[PDB]
């Protein structure tokens, strides 16, 4: 039970951090790319995604 | 085509720019029938 509770907290945080690598349909998952590759009026649509 | 939010070009960059959330209209017509190198714009 205790090792399971520690594992669930680990899997939740590990999933939550892994989500930062995902696109969600943006042009890059790296926020600093979107903010440098594209002009703000274009970029904001990808950032809002 | 430069006279809109989210555009780029010499006018839209260096001379006259509309806010990204501009709230109104743009109206145009050709002026050749009235206009002569007297009209100037910015390049630097």
From Swiss-Prot, chain A:
Changing residue 8 to H: In strain: Omicron/BA.1, Omicron/BA.2, Omicron/BA.2.12.1, Omicron/BA.2.75, Omicron/BA.4, Omicron/BA.5, Omicron/BQ.1.1, Omicron/XBB.1.5, Omicron/EG.5.1. Changing residue 35 to F: In strain: Omicron/BA.1. Residues 3-47 form a coiled coil. Subunit of the fusion protein that is processed upon entry into the host cell. Mediates fusion of the virion and cellular membranes by functioning as a class I viral fusion protein. Contains a viral fusion peptide that is unmasked after S2 cleavage. This cleavage can occur at the cell membrane by host TMPRSS2 or during endocytosis by host CSTL. In either case, this triggers an extensive and irreversible conformational change that leads to fusion of the viral envelope with the cellular cytoplasmic membrane, releasing viral genomic RNA into the host cell cytoplasm. This is Spike protein S2'. It comes from Severe acute respiratory syndrome coronavirus 2 (2019-nCoV). The lineage of its organism: Viruses, Riboviria, Orthornavirae, Pisuviricota, Pisoniviricetes. The gene is S.
């Amino acid at each position: 039970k205790l090792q399971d509770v520690v594992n669930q907290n680990a899997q939740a945080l590990n999933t939550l951090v892994k989500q930062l690598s995902s696109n969600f349909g943006a042009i890059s998952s790296v926020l600093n790319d979107i903010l440098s590759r594209l002009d703000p009026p274009e970029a904001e649509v990808q950032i809002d995604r | 085509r430069q006279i809109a939010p989210g555009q780029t070009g010499k006018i839209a960059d260096y001379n006259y720019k509309l806010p990204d959330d501009f709230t109104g209209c743009v109206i145009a017509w050709n002026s050749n029938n009235l206009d002569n190198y007297n009209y100037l714009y910015r390049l630097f």
